[PDB]
C-alpha cells in the first residue's frame, strides 16, 4: 500500500508542515566512500 506522510505541525518546526509518499518499494543506497575502499 502506498501511504501518505503528513505529520501535524504546531521548540522549532519546519517552515511549513511536510508531506510526502511512502512506497512499497525498497531502494539501494551505496553513497559512501568507505563502502568501496577498505581501510588498507
Amino acid at each position: 500500500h502506498y501511504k501518505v506522510f503528513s505529520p501535524a505541525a504546531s521548540k522549532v518546526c519546519t517552515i511549513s508542515p511536510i508531506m510526502g509518499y511512502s512506497t512499497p518499494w525498497r531502494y539501494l543506497d551505496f553513497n559512501a566512500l568507505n563502502l568501496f575502499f577498505s581501510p588498507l
Binding site: 502506498y2 501518505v4 506522510f5 503528513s6 505529520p7 501535524a8 505541525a9 504546531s10 511549513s16 508542515p17 511536510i18 508531506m19 510526502g20 509518499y21 511512502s22 512506497t23 512499497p24 518499494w25 525498497r26 531502494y27 539501494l28 543506497d29 551505496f30 553513497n31 559512501a32 568507505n34 563502502l35
Partner: protein, 150 residues
C-alpha cells in the same frame, strides 16, 4: 532502475540508509519515500497546519512503469557514467596564501598613516608584516563560528 530520473531522488542526503561498512553484514535496503509540495491547511481552531496534497503534489506510483521481474538465481546490471567533475585534491599546502611574499624585503607600496581629508601614506618595512598588501582575498564565511560563540 530510474535511468530517466522520473521519480524523486532521495539519495545523497546523509540519511541512515547506507550499506553496511563491513562485508560480513547483511544490507537491509531502505523503504522508498519522498516529500512533495502541497497546500498548507489549518486544522480547525487549534491553528495546527498540515500540508494537504494539492494539484502540484506529485503522487508517484512505481507499479505504473516498465520494470524487470527477476526469478531466483537471476541477475541484473546497471551501468552509469559520472559527468566530468572537479577532482578532490588529496594533498595539502605548505604555505599560507597571505604569506606568499619575501620576508626579507619590504613592500614598494605604501599604506595610510594619518587619515582625514588629506591622508598621508607611509612606506612599508619588513618589521610590519600584518599590513602587507594582498593580491587575492580570502574565501567567504557565513556563520563560521564555534559552538562556544553561539
Amino acid at each position: 532502475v530510474d535511468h530517466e530520473y522520473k521519480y524523486p531522488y532521495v539519495l545523497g542526503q546523509g540519511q541512515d540508509t547506507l550499506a553496511p561498512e563491513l562485508p560480513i553484514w547483511v544490507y537491509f535496503p531502505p523503504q522508498y519515500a519522498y516529500l512533495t509540495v502541497g497546500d498548507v491547511n489549518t486544522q480547525g481552531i487549534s491553528g495546527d497546519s498540515k500540508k494537504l496534497a494539492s494539484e502540484e503534489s506529485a503522487f508517484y506510483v512505481l507499479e505504473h512503469s516498465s520494470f524487470q521481474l527477476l526469478g531466483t538465481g537471476g541477475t541484473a546490471t546497471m551501468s552509469y557514467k559520472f559527468p566530468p567533475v572537479p577532482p578532490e585534491n588529496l594533498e595539502g599546502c605548505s604555505q599560507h596564501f597571505y604569506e606568499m611574499y619575501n620576508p626579507l624585503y619590504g613592500s614598494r607600496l605604501g599604506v595610510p598613516d594619518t587619515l582625514g581629508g588629506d591622508p598621508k601614506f607611509r612606506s612599508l618595512t619588513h618589521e610590519d608584516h600584518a599590513i602587507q598588501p594582498q593580491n587575492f582575498m580570502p574565501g567567504p564565511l557565513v556563520n563560521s563560528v564555534s559552538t562556544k560563540e553561539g
